[PDB]
Nucleic acid binder design. Structure first.
Ligand SMILES: [K+]
Ligand SMILES: [K+]
Ligand SMILES: [Mg+2]
Ligand SMILES: [Mg+2]
Ligand SMILES: [Mg+2]
Ligand SMILES: [Mg+2]
Ligand SMILES: [Mg+2]
Ligand SMILES: [Mg+2]
Ligand SMILES: [Mg+2]
Ligand SMILES: [Mg+2]
Ligand SMILES: [Mg+2]
Ligand SMILES: [Mg+2]
Ligand SMILES: [Mg+2]
Ligand SMILES: [Mg+2]
Ligand SMILES: [Mg+2]
Ligand SMILES: [Mg+2]
Ligand SMILES: [Mg+2]
Ligand SMILES: [Mg+2]
Ligand SMILES: [Mg+2]
Ligand SMILES: [Mg+2]
Ligand SMILES: [Mg+2]
Ligand SMILES: [Mg+2]
Ligand SMILES: [Mg+2]
Ligand SMILES: [Mg+2]
Ligand SMILES: [Mg+2]
Ligand SMILES: [Mg+2]
Ligand SMILES: [Mg+2]
Ligand SMILES: [Mg+2]
Ligand SMILES: [Mg+2]
Ligand SMILES: [Mg+2]
Ligand SMILES: [Mg+2]
Ligand SMILES: [Mg+2]
Ligand SMILES: [Zn+2]
Lengths: 305, 110, 154, 59, 149
RNA sequence: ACCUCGAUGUUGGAUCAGGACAUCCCGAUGGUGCAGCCGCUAUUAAAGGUUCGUUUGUUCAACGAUUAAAGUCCUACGUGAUCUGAGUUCAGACCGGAGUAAUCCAGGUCGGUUUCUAUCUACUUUCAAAUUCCUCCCUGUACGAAAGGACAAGAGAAAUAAGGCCUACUUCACAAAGCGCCUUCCCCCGUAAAUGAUAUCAUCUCAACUUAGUAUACCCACCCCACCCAAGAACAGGGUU
RNA sequence: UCUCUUACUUUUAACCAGUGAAAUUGACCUGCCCGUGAAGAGGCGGGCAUAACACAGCAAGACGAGAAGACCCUAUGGAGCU
RNA sequence: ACUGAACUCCUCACACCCAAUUGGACCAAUCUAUCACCCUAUAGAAGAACUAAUGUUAGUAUAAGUAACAUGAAAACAUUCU
RNA sequence: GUAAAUUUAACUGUUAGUCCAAAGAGGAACAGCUCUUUGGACACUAGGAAAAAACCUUGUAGAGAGAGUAAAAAAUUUAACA
């Protein structure tokens, strides 16, 4: 009637073997999915207006400055896509929704820290378990076979994307830091009231309206950014350079997809559809993919005239 | 602020006897393979740790009688010796502590 | 908000925090094994690990001598540090101290721990031992390993 | 509790399980009046005309 | 209560009166005192009334135990096993005579609330109502908006 | 003078505001003694906004500089178990006045204790659609005799608001934070017109009819002793390869 | 001080262990809106909402609690002073 | 047409729905006279009946296991250290 | 038509009233305003006006798982024209 862990009863000679044994299996499964177009891929429909393709699950590395040919310093966020795969497909009929849902995972984690139900799901799929799993709404022509890996080449420079992740949790915070209330002066007779909300409602109602700004936990919630364009794409390390800052701390998993903004609609005509396949590409992509206005580090010093 | 009304025992039972207030049963208890007494899986056995302290206190009392005062810490290694033992080949040039007692079984000489 | 804070808040202040850890560290050098509350032991463990590194720099190093002079309130332990503890761990590069949890004291039911320097002359603690290789679970994994090694050589 | 035993369907499509356990179809309270194009010629000719329009009226 | 007291349905003992009437009263125990004003009404009842009362009801056994007591009592035992104990302390002859006759008429069941003033074992003769009683049958018993073959 | 004389002093400010529309500004649309800019007036519109200071206890107001605007109110003349106690209010005193005096004052002046450990209700991330100004272009165009001087659409820049972040800068250093950086996506139905009968014309129709403006995104599984944690009051949550 | 707050330490705080009060309390199985009423409703009328449940915050309500409060008036009730 | 009262009627029993005040009929327990002798009778007598006076004394709840309170460190408990 | 009335004896208690209808004053042909008069209701039950002291229905008292009734549910959609 007592719980147990994976290496409670293992001896000194077995623990290194078990760690190495499961590590080798993870490498084999990840290296056995690098050929999606040969292992009976699903039909690849051409791009059509009004179609939504799947996104990625990236990890926020940090921030790095980036200069354009216009001489403006733009700061970008390095989003690393690692061990990103498609888990399962749900049709529109089975989705009970307008769009078809597709499951994506990322950041392969240990198999010893997951429930039995989750582990057996990956056992038949032949992939290591993923930490964060996001669901993307796609169309019928954007279906992707389960187990298909995804790379940072799925996006291209000049494309606006939306990043979703949990914000940095600041714990329980007062109204001054959570909602930006002015507070009370530190002097001129004030007695034990410098950072208090003050009045919360009127006397006639005799109650507090729902949604009233009161002290409580701030952060650790999902927030989505919109209208963030990609300035640079690295294919060797699968890194997406997303303009500005994105919600979440360092080394956090984010959900990335195309911009929902109407101004950025019907811009995926020249973008890969449904996704980029390095296995079957007729020509390997360059080391780095830049934007038109981006001045590469190898280029000489920009000389405005 | 003072209570407007007296809270009944029916309300109090729901608060005092709530599962959060109740003590949580522990599942990390097992028997010590050495002495058989109970211990936690992440905590050293109380019975086994107690006999180490009793022997350690006796050893430290012998050390005090040799230094004969504070600020007299030796600059060499220390060896604990029992009845029926002699300094070993590797225990040369060290401070030996003689104990008028048989070496404990759990105490492995090194 | 406390993100990235690696140091704990103890004593009557930052200065008192050093003095409390200094007394624990000094008592650890003299006795080579002490028992104290778990949080103070864990905080002091980092200083004990790096104290040996200054002892390996040699007693002729002015910088290493000042750290020994400061962190050792009792001046008789300074010759011991550079002539006993430092030579003892000459081959080792780290992990000189081991920290284990002990039953809470009866005075205030505080979480307690014991910290000692490896290789001491004191009786060994009843260290936790993993299950023997002769157990049923280990033998099944041992048999699997043998076939995997045999299959690889094939 | 009574609202749980009430089933609404926007169209004439009904799930089989709900459709397979029906018993009686209650009559509609309001009788739908007939459109002018649903009248047969027998009823249209039965109803007499009340006035004689002039022959020179453009209408 | 009604909520604070138990209740029972109207019933009799072994369907009394269905084939024959059986007097449910079984025993009377009177405890009168030779001396004591509390039994003055009871002593007069024993001297002239209980003799004629025993003539009318031969199926009831009457015991008259004369012992010193401060409160004379009458104990009535019934066939169903219920025992009703009543006090006739300082009651007139007429009040005792009416009370004893009331005990003779009762069946012994508890004097509590009766849920219904009627009790019938066959309430329905033409068939108890069911929702299909007043619904006409359709050809082949087809369900509404159901097509066959 | 109906409720409160067996513990709300009132005013004003600070804090945070919810609501009305009889609309100060942004939006749409008639009329004009509407050329164009400015204006006036009326219908529609409460999504959003509505400044900082000097003397004054101030509310208000005066004028100082601005702004697309610095709206009228209600809410226990909102909010004082959140705060302030400046004016008035208890004991001191003074000036002026009344009184034989004690003493008084709708005036002036100075000083004068603002308690409370939350039992109950309510509430404690509305999971996410933003507004505005200026400059530019149209354009020195339409208009006008000139003086003057616009629509709509597009661009840029800035500010606030909402929501994030730490590559720099800054307070600072395994981090937090702004003074710093990043992102921000719907129409608004007042009316202007066709066809066309009652009332064989006409008439935009509380006549049948036609036309113009008449949603998406986020969230979704089910070893744990213990350690670690960008997760956290506790609990919970993530990682432990 | 403020525009405009922010960081850190200490106490407090919260949790574990020990000891253990006070004002308060008609009974409560203690909701929102509108209306009504001794004229300001958790309890009445009409609608709406609603498994149970502890912990931590908050201070709009319970005309919250604490000294028959202050404030005007009453008494053929007192006292000081002139 | 129906619904609709404590009005009326029906079966049965009837002293058995007003403040202050007034007239009654009964009566708990206690003591005494005389009875009575598992707790009663007839009389006399009176410290003769408590859901309420911010009542008095005592017990125990509620707030509440809350507020608040406390022991510098190691150790051979010699001692040393801050 | 009805059954009360007066006198005699013995004392208590109530008289800081409300609202409705009506007549008339004061205010402003305002007030849940003030002040008289007549009458009703209320401080006495029940039903109906949404909740309801004062409006309407209705009183003399119990039981019933009978019956007949009293008061008792707002209406209203408006501009052609020689
Ligand atoms: K009060
Ligand atoms: K409150
Ligand atoms: Mg945190
Ligand atoms: Mg401030
Ligand atoms: Mg104070
Ligand atoms: Mg202060
Ligand atoms: Mg501390
Ligand atoms: Mg308007
Ligand atoms: Mg106010
Ligand atoms: Mg105030
Ligand atoms: Mg208040
Ligand atoms: Mg003052
Ligand atoms: Mg003053
Ligand atoms: Mg911000
Ligand atoms: Mg405690
Ligand atoms: Mg008390
Ligand atoms: Mg409840
Ligand atoms: Mg109300
Ligand atoms: Mg209600
Ligand atoms: Mg609470
Ligand atoms: Mg408080
Ligand atoms: Mg008088
Ligand atoms: Mg009746
Ligand atoms: Mg009657
Ligand atoms: Mg009667
Ligand atoms: Mg008597
Ligand atoms: Mg008495
Ligand atoms: Mg009592
Ligand atoms: Mg009392
Ligand atoms: Mg409390
Ligand atoms: Mg405390
Ligand atoms: Mg102390
Ligand atoms: Zn043991």
């Amino acid at each position: 009637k007592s719980g147990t862990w994976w290496d409670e009863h293992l001896s000194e000679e077995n623990v290194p073997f078990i760690k190495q044994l499961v590590s080798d299996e993870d490498k084999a499964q990840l290296a056995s999915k690098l050929c999606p177009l040969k292992d009976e891929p699903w039909p690849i429909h051409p791009w059509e207006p009004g179609s939504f393709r799947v996104g990625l699950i990236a990890l926020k590395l940090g921030m790095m400055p980036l200069w354009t040919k216009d001489g403006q310093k733009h700061v970008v966020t390095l989003l690393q896509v690692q061990d990103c795969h498609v888990l399962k497909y749900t049709s529109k009929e089975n989705c009970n929704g307008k769009m078809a849902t597709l499951s994506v995972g990322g950041k392969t984690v240990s198999r010893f820290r997951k429930a039995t139900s989750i582990l057996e799901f990956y056992r038949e799929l032949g992939l290591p378990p993923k930490q964060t799993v996001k669901i993307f709404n796609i169309t019928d022509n954007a279906a992707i076979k389960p187990g298909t890996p995804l790379y940072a080449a799925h996006f291209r420079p000049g494309q606006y994307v939306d990043v979703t992740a949990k914000t940095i949790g600041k714990g329980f915070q007062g109204v001054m830091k959570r909602w930006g209330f002015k507070g009370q002066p530190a002097t001129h007779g004030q007695t034990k009231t410098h950072r208090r909300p003050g009045a919360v409602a009127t006397g006639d109602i005799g109650r507090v309206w729902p949604g009233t700004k009161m002290p409580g936990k701030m952060g650790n919630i999902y927030r989505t950014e919109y209208g963030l364009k990609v300035w640079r794409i690295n294919t060797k390390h699968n890194i997406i350079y997303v303009n500005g800052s994105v919600p979440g701390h360092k080394n956090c998993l984010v959900k990335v997809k195309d911009s929902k903004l109407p101004a950025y609609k019907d811009l995926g005509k020249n973008l890969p559809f449904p996704t980029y396949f390095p296995d079957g590409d007729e020509e390997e992509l360059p080391e780095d993919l830049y934007d038109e206005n981006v001045c590469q580090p190898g280029a000489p010093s920009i000389t405005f005239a | 602020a003072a209570p407007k009304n007296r809270r009944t025992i029916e309300v109090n039972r729901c608060r005092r006897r709530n599962p959060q207030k109740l003590i949580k049963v522990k599942n990390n208890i097992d028997v010590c393979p050495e002495c058989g007494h109970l211990k936690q899986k992440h905590v050293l056995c109380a019975y086994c740790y107690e006999k180490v302290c009793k022997e350690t206190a006796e050893i430290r009392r012998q050390i005090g009688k040799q230094e004969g005062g504070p600020f007299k810490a030796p600059t060499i290694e220390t060896v604990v010796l029992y009845t029926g033992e002699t300094p070993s080949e590797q225990d040369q040039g060290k401070r030996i502590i003689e104990r008028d007692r048989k070496r404990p079984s759990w105490f492995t000489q090194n | 908000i406390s993100h990235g804070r690696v140091f704990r808040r103890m004593g009557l202040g930052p200065e008192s925090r050093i003095h409390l850890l200094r007394n624990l560290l000094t008592g650890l050098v003299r006795h080579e094994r002490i028992e104290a509350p778990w949080a103070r032991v864990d905080e002091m463990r980092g200083y004990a690990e790096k104290l040996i590194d200054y002892g390996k720099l040699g007693d002729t190093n002015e910088r290493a001598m000042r750290m020994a002079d400061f962190w050792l309130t009792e001046k008789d332990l300074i010759p011991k540090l550079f002539q006993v503890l430092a030579p003892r761990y000459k081959d080792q590069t780290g992990g000189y101290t081991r920290m284990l949890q002990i039953p809470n004291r009866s005075l205030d039911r505080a979480k307690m721990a014991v910290i000692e320097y490896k290789g001491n002359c004191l009786p060994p603690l009843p260290l936790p031992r993993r299950d023997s290789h002769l157990t049923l679970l280990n033998q099944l994994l041992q048999g699997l390993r043998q076939d995997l090694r045999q299959s690889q050589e094939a | 509790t009574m609202m749980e035993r009430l089933h609404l369907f926007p169209d004439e499509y009904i799930p089989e399980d709900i459709l397979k356990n029906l018993v009686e179809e209650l009559p509609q309270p309001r009788k739908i009046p007939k459109r002018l194009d649903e009248y047969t010629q027998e009823e249209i000719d039965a109803f007499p005309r009340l006035w004689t329009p002039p022959e020179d009226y453009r209408l | 209560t009604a909520r604070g007291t138990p209740s029972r349905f109207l019933a009799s003992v072994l369907h009394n009166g269905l084939g024959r009437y059986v007097q449910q009263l079984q025993r009377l125990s009177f405890s009168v005192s030779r001396d004591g004003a509390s039994s003055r009404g009871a002593r007069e009842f024993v001297e002239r009334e209980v003799i004629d009362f025993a003539r009318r009801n031969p199926g009831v056994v009457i015991y008259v135990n004369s012992r010193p007591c401060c409160v004379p009592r009458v104990v009535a035992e019934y066939l169903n096993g219920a025992v009703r104990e009543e006090s006739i302390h300082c009651k007139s002859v007429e009040e005792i005579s009416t009370l004893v006759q009331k005990l003779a008429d009762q069946s012994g069941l508890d004097v509590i609330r009766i849920r219904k003033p009627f009790h019938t074992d066959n309430p329905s003769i033409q068939g108890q109502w069911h929702p299909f009683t007043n619904k006409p049958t359709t050809f082949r018993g087809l369900r509404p908006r159901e097509v066959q073959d």
